[PDB]
Symmetry: C5
Subunit: 270 residues, 5 copies
């Protein structure tokens, strides 16, 4: 939302009403000096800084989580190749679950229908199993767990090597919880609330308290200052929705294609 070019423009308009209405000032007895707006301005900058910090960390964590999908699924596929080179059937099954897991997680975070993707990757019976669950993505881990478990029952994996691969499903479990946590735990609203008020009220009142000092250069300076606060406030906005579909949000489709392309590269009998 580029209300930035709206507020920038609404700012010019506030400068102009300030310039012309500057007379009726002492009649009334209303004075605005810079100094107390420097105090508030500074306080707001500090609080914006700390807040944007949190915003940024949340977005970084969203990237890291998704990064771990790629890492853990890569490594699970590696272990399967290196430990069971012969077993391409199991290879293909486990891969399709891992790929399904990624897509499913994207769908869940975007609240979209994973049915088509699941159906492209899995047999109908497995899809039914997945979609029947109140927690589909988590049920994909269970099914992948079951493949690993069969290999174990059949003696193709020992307890040790079964365990090496289980750890990978643990990591994917940490991704899934993390994303869920992030999705339902925003940076607290109070922050963005408080700050949105103060930053808007501030950019509004500002040309009024600059007009005393600047006369005609009010608009050009009040705009430059306001853009600075709003640019910085809006970087938070652009970082607060990691899973969304906006241009600034995570390109989750491409990340899913990357994951799928990677797992497919590591298979094919080679």
């Amino acid at each position: 939302l580029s209300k930035i070019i709206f507020r920038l423009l609404l700012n010019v308009l506030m400068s102009i009403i300030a310039i012309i209405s500057y007379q009726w000032y002492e009649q009334l007895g209303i004075h605005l000096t810079v100094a107390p707006f420097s105090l508030l301005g500074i306080a707001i900058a500090i609080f914006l800084g700390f807040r944007n910090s949190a915003s940024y960390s949340r977005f970084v964590e969203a990237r890291n989580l998704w990064g771990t999908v790629l890492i853990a699924e890569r490594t699970l596929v590696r272990q399967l190749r290196n430990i069971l080179p012969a077993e391409h059937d199991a290879h293909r099954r486990i891969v399709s679950y891992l790929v399904a897991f990624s897509w499913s997680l994207k769908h869940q975070l975007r609240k979209t229908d994973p049915t088509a993707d699941l159906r492209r990757l899995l047999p109908e019976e497995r899809v039914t199993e997945i979609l029947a669950s109140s927690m589909p993505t988590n049920r994909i881990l269970l099914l992948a767990g079951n493949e690993i478990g069969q290999l174990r029952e059949a003696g193709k994996l020992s307890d040790i090597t079964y365990g090496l691969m289980d750890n990978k499903l643990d990591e994917l479990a940490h991704v899934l919880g993390g994303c869920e946590r992030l999705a339902t735990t925003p940076v607290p609203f109070a922050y963005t609330l408080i700050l949105q008020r103060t930053v808007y009220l501030f950019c509004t009142l500002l040309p009024f308290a600059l007009v005393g000092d600047l006369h005609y250069m009010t608009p050009f300076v009040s705009v430059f200052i306001s853009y600075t606060f709003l640019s910085w406030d809006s970087l938070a906005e652009e970082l607060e929705d990691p899973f969304g579909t906006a241009a600034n949000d995570l390109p989750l489709n491409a990340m899913c294609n990357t994951i799928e392309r990677n797992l497919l590269d590591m298979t094919g009998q080679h």
Copy 2:
């Protein structure tokens, strides 16, 4: 808002200063802005650090709770994956894990666990659990006996027992982390004196503002007091993430989620 009170209180004090500004020279009282710029910026800097510290507590607490869901999900998965047919154990262990969550929430909210416990476990167990001064720990220990017995009975190997044992440790770390964020507050000086300071600063501020703003002073002073006081109380809220304030953690919702997860479809699983 206890804030709306003190915001209005700041408007009264701000009128007082508009009426007093002539009588300044009579009484002998000059008051420039610049010392209040100095003081205000210091307080802002300290409010920044304090707030950041509070948020960290919030975020750790949120995370420790996230681990409950993860760890419990992976323990159930492992039991389903390794002992697919052992539904009686599945059911027993899941109820301990669910008891674990609720018990932890009660522990931290200082409320009575009994209703939630009885809902989930047989009564002998509820008394074994309520008998301990550490009920959450006792639930963990009981959950441990379940996997221990599967091992004694040769149903788990040492390896596979260990994979599950790891998950109980993960929950032990949550229990410990949560107890540390609960019993251990951030010292009472931090809040006690910082609140004094922010308020004292806010009331005096217009006295120093008049000379410059004259009439506009009640406005531009309430705006400043909002900013400082908003920030201070939010910090105070977030410091106690298991409290029942608006910006604290939805502990009830989070246990509902955990429960719905483990018990999803009468606990039925494929293969």
Copy 3:
């Protein structure tokens, strides 16, 4: 007498000295404005802010270190119960080592005498061994490990299950190193050196600069600015020795109590 008040009262005095002496300023050739004191005050506030941040983090780390003791001991005893439910002989021995470890750790950090706490807990053949070492706490860990080792040699623990319990001793190992590191490595004394000087001198010289602008108001404002600064500075100092005996420091006594009661509860004592 309480130091902070003394420094406040020494500041109300510094202020009067400044009101009375403002007359002589013109004469003696001393002009003092607020603006440079702003620059300095802010600078000091910034550095005070980051400094306090470090002190808090040190306090938090100590807290976490102690939290690990309770976690790792609980899970060790839990494992002992879950893996060897019959072997209460070993349970009791190991639990007493774990309880000794905490008290030993506590006393070590307080630079006090473990003898009573250890005598309350262990046999004399062991207490003297432990006190014979310049590293008692590490020695208790070595002994807890013997227990776990014996159970392994006796075939009661497999290599694997031994392994599971070994990790928990490692975790206690890290707590010991951490606490020792915090006890012996201070927040560089330079932090308290530069900041105590600077903050005191600043609060002192400040009324001399406020008087120009504030006159008889000087005391009120200057004491305020001083309380803010000194309050923040002293908070850093209290947070910095987390292992101290102040009421503002960690209640190590209560924590070791919680630990002991906890492991006893788990063994049915």
Copy 4:
């Protein structure tokens, strides 16, 4: 940078010889407003430079891990299979291939020469076919370890100890990829840069009122401070970007090669 210092001096000299015309027209520039702007920018640069620094440090840590993992893997190979020098040499090849290949991948440069020197041409073709060559190298390292296991020279346990090390390299590969196909601040980084750029150009105009002829000196000093801090952030933000200092990455890949040749007695020269 030096271009923007010279432009700042030019803008200063303009500010001086035009101070007359403009301030008479009713267009004024005080210092207090630009002091508010500049402090806020400074605050933002501070927070920004912190995010930057920490991406730089994360890059150091990831590359640190390569050094650590690769050393410990080769150590394990020697301690567990002292006799299997052919395997030692193959595995060391892939490990060193991995480093160089990662470096090439991050710096968008050609890995071919490094691969051709280290590996058989079959392997190089396979690696070069893949859209993920670095990952492929790890996969090849994996087969080496996997074969020693299949041949019964490694047990599942000791296989596992080495498998850990490969996972560590997987974490590095991905972390680095994430640090490259960055950033996270989606080119706001150009906004703040222009904000600083503009602030520094308007600055002499806001200053000349108070400084007159001293303007260019005090304006350039301030500009230098702001522009430097901004430049530092830009450097730090982008550890793998096209203008990055390649000395340390090259030093690291050289160190690991040297260390591993040392560990497998390929150094020193025989007598």
Copy 5:
């Protein structure tokens, strides 16, 4: 050094007083307000920077903490798992102690030969000295000891593994210290911040003088002290393996390490 810049600063204040007369005449005005802006900017930057420096120092301290922990726990595992193998005990301890001293040498860029000779047979010294990285070669030798115990069937794969993990931890320590030592952030950008604070401090009185007159040097020195104190403390912490006041007592830390390992293996300093 700090006292040099302070004296040079008292001098420059006088230059500003004596030459304030010519100010009007030469056509040079210098207000406080612009210097406040620069000043606060720089303070913010020093605040952030100093905090990065402290972070590095705390990490360095921590890494050394792990040497002690990992080494203690390795010896512990050796005693608990192989109580009879006291030859191995002694040889591995020799390597672990060699490791610490060699690490100090590496970080101080000094010769490890004396310390190595005190601890190990000459054949082993030659092997260790021949390597581009003596500390890495020491871990490999420690690794053969446990490896040989594994070959001989005296350790299982599992118990070898528990011990392997500790060597893995030492490798991590080595790496982290290597990273912190060779981690001059572009050598340019610490020299640039130094000239910055320096230049600012020398120009400050010229700007302060209009307001302060004779008081210039007092305020100007107080301010310069504050900023320089901050800046130089950062520089110390930035290089924790150096030989400055507030840099790690690495020789003391190595002594503690050696003493601990000797204590654990029944030997007497």
